[PDB]
Design a protein around this ligand. Structure first.
Ligand SMILES: Cc1ccncc1NC(=O)C1(c2cccc(Cl)c2)CC1
Ligand SMILES: Cc1ccncc1NC(=O)C1(c2cccc(Cl)c2)CC1
Lengths: 304, 304
């Protein structure tokens, strides 16, 4: 039936995007109820970004300095406050398009959709994973700050990410919706170390199960392994160590395919040690890790 | 800044999806104005699909046999007609969420977003290309028929695809919104030949320009080629022959990067003849062809 890097339908989030302008700077905001959320660096100029004192910069700002526009209508700002690295602008009107929502802080290795926006207008949607080093490999340009990451369960949107910064390496950093950065990052124009990244082992295994379900079975072999033997291979190839918690999460996929998790680990071990020999798996020439076991179950069952 | 396989924001299309049921069969429909569009095979049972006489099957059906539901509200069907492989159900209510739209028949090699749906409810969104052989490599299960492909320009949705069928090979076939199949396919449960597919050369080149813009430059070399010399390599590797029309379309990317199109062809020639030697380009270990030159310009400039 096929397998694609699928994002959630973005409609519920599109109806929340607004443009926030403070003096010279314009970025995106998320309008939920009567609050607009945006990166606090909207109050900076390029000269400030080198080492900003956000508290002092925000003191020079009043409610009337924040211009919030939803499509073409201007919102009236009646309160402003800084929570960690986000600003919360109280407006006099609740968003009539506010979906059922939650703010969640996702774990590294989990996936989410990003609705990239410019001037409060959506441009596109893509699926990605929060890397084990708390960076994301997105697609963002100047003006995209304030774009958010989310998951959708039934009718409830769980916002997990707000885009803030591009590291000098081209990878992306941002916060949860409480303004706490994922990783060691600070909202400052300084060179910042992103830790060593690893491949999300449980996600690669989940994707190997997706491949078997969709017919790509060439990599299945006559071997098995143990968690300890497999983890010696995972360490050499910079893969996250596999735990029984990971094996347990792969249980639904093992029950459906009839392939024991450690037998799939032995396929992955051989792929790590021998490569793909010029072959592909689900249209990829590398081991894909941005699909969780839940994503595989969801896509392979047709959950809406 | 990064480069991702980005889909259009699906909100405008989500508001058009409905569930259509005819007797035992349920699939998705697209509600635009007072017409609901869906695959005509909604009128078949499994016994009919082997060799259906759609004209005769549709004669046994009246307006009241088509159950159309938009979320939780029932639409009143007042007319029904078959146009090629699609049914058009006239309803007594115009969709209040109908966006500015057009029906377009896209060309092979062009890209579009798919909003996969089940029971009239969206599950996800992904970007894909209409293959040169008029198939699409999507992600669809039973119940996904009627899901549509589209492009968005400013505020206008151009619907180009309606999903109808999975070939025994696992690839997908469907129609334009006038119900004309792309390719030689017929809506019948018979083994059907999809032609030999080729790699979309102009899209690979566009993606190589996207890689240079985003820093991946290892593949650039000290060589050049000619259209005729390059096309001898394209034929051997099952790539579409490059024409001056393709070179002309790559003009904006050549002007921005300062790399002449034939110099980029020489990089592609060497990649075809030598492989990637275990290296990657924009996170891929293979040559990607599902990004048009327009897609690259759009993503790299931030068009909303
Ligand atoms: C230009 C760009 C591209 C992609 N994503 C984001 C950006 N923007 C940035 O990085 C900016 C910045 C600078 C330093 C630290 C922080 Cl928190 C933010 C706004 C200028
Ligand atoms: C089951 C499925 C999976 C993915 N995409 C689509 C489907 N559905 C089909 O192919 C069906 C069919 C059969 C033969 C010809 C035609 Cl036009 C349609 C409905 C049963």
């Amino acid at each position: 039936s096929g397998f694609r890097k699928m994002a959630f339908p973005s409609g519920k989030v599109e109806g929340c995007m607004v443009q926030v302008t403070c003096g010279t700077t314009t970025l995106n905001g998320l309008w939920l109820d009567d609050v607009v959320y945006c990166p606090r660096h909207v109050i900076c100029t390029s000269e400030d970004m080198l080492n900003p004192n956000y508290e002092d910069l925000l003191i020079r700002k009043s409610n009337h300095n924040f211009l919030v526009q939803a499509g073409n209508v201007q919102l009236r700002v009646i309160g402003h406050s800084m929570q960690n690295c986000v600003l919360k602008l109280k407006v006099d009107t609740a968003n009539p398009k506010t979906p059922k929502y939650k703010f969640v802080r996702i774990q590294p290795g989990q996936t989410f959709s990003v609705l990239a926006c410019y001037n409060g207008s959506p441009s596109g949607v893509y699926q990605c994973a929060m890397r084990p080093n708390f960076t994301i490999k997105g697609s963002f340009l100047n003006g995209s700050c304030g774009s958010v990451g989310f998951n959708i369960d039934y009718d409830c949107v769980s916002f997990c990410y707000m885009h803030h910064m591009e590291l000098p390496t081209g990878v992306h950093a941002g916060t949860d919706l409480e303004g706490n950065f994922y990783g060691p990052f600070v909202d400052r124009q300084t060179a910042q170390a992103a830790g060593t990244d690893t491949t999300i082992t449980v996600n690669v295994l989940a994707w190997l199960y997706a491949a078997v379900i969709n017919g790509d079975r060439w990599f299945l072999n006559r071997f098995t392994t143990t968690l300890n033997d497999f983890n010696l291979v995972a360490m050499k190839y910079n893969y996250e160590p596999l735990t029984q918690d990971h094996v347990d999460i792969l249980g639904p996929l093992s029950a459906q395919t009839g392939i024991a998790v450690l037998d799939m680990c032995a396929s992955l071990k051989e792929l790590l040690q021998n490569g793909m020999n010029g072959r592909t798996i689900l249209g990829s020439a590398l081991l894909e890790d941005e699909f969780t076991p839940f994503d595989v179950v969801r896509q392979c069952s047709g959950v809406t």
